[PDB]
Amino acid sequence: ARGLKKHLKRLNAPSHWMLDKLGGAFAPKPSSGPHKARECLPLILILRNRLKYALTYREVQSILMQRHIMVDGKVRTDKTYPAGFMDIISIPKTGENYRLLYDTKGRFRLHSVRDEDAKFKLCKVRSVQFGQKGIPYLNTYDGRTIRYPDPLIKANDTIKLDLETNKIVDFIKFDVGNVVMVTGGRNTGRVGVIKNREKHKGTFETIHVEDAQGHQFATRLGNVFTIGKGTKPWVSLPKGKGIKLTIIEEQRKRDAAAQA
């Protein structure tokens, strides 16, 4: 190619979007923004496929051009805006607030949150280093730069950001024993506590996580997001509570529900 791609073929769209195969030749190509294209949930999908507010592309445009949707406290009119993990989606007309979390099957789920709980997001620190003028600055995986961060904050940390004031109100150090959520790979959406961190020089670092029921899983450092200090996450979790179920137990639940 002689430049950037503008189109996303529907077959080549992320599989967690759960787009259907015959809905068209194309999928919404996510715009550049805070989250990666392959790891985000675009606004058009949230509005039409998930919340059912809109029925068409044009209806999503109509809703967004009314300035009805705020992402993390700010009005977005781009339909392909890449909304991502832990983002607050608020509609200050119906009075509903949503935190974009992962279910245990790797798919973004709009989790309803309280009005007070929609006043902060959780960000993962990507790096800490000196900017111009020798001023220390923090950057996250959701594209934010924060200057003069707390010196106790290091890379891979989780900071609590107040959307109203745009400051770090609290932070969590990436340590063994902190409850985490996996945001990438086959364990996406799984919640557990870190048991040990296995480091290997020159290559990716492996984190060993054990969930509440005792199942153990391992994932790379880049796919781990701390959500609480200790065994108590700072945000509310979806109904699964991050506890992945085997297909046999899912069938048990379905059989019990049908029997009732």
């Binding site: 059912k52 507010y53 809109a54 209806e59 109509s62 009805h68 509609i91 007309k93």
Partner: protein, 124 residues
Amino acid sequence: TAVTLRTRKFMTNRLLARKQFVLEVIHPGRANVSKAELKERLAKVYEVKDPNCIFVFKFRTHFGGGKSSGFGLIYDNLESAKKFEPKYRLIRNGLATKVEKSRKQIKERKNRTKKIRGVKKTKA
């Protein structure tokens, strides 16, 4: 005979200021209930003051007859509908007029006028 109306998948879409639902029509002894008759019945059912705020579409009679399914929108007011509704549905409901144009003729005229510069473009 007795046409019974049943609204399912109902939601109040305040962003677009309308009610949207799946409309299930049960018409034993009838071929299918026309969209106008469904509009009047829905206006009676939902106490719609202006029945031009009701739009029903995508109707499908099942195999073996006797019942049909479609989708229905009821706008809170006529200005909401004229702003959010697609033009072809308004034309269906009589709220708009179909402008008869040929896309190919527009294309040819556009090319011919692109060959010209100035205010003389309109006279070409």
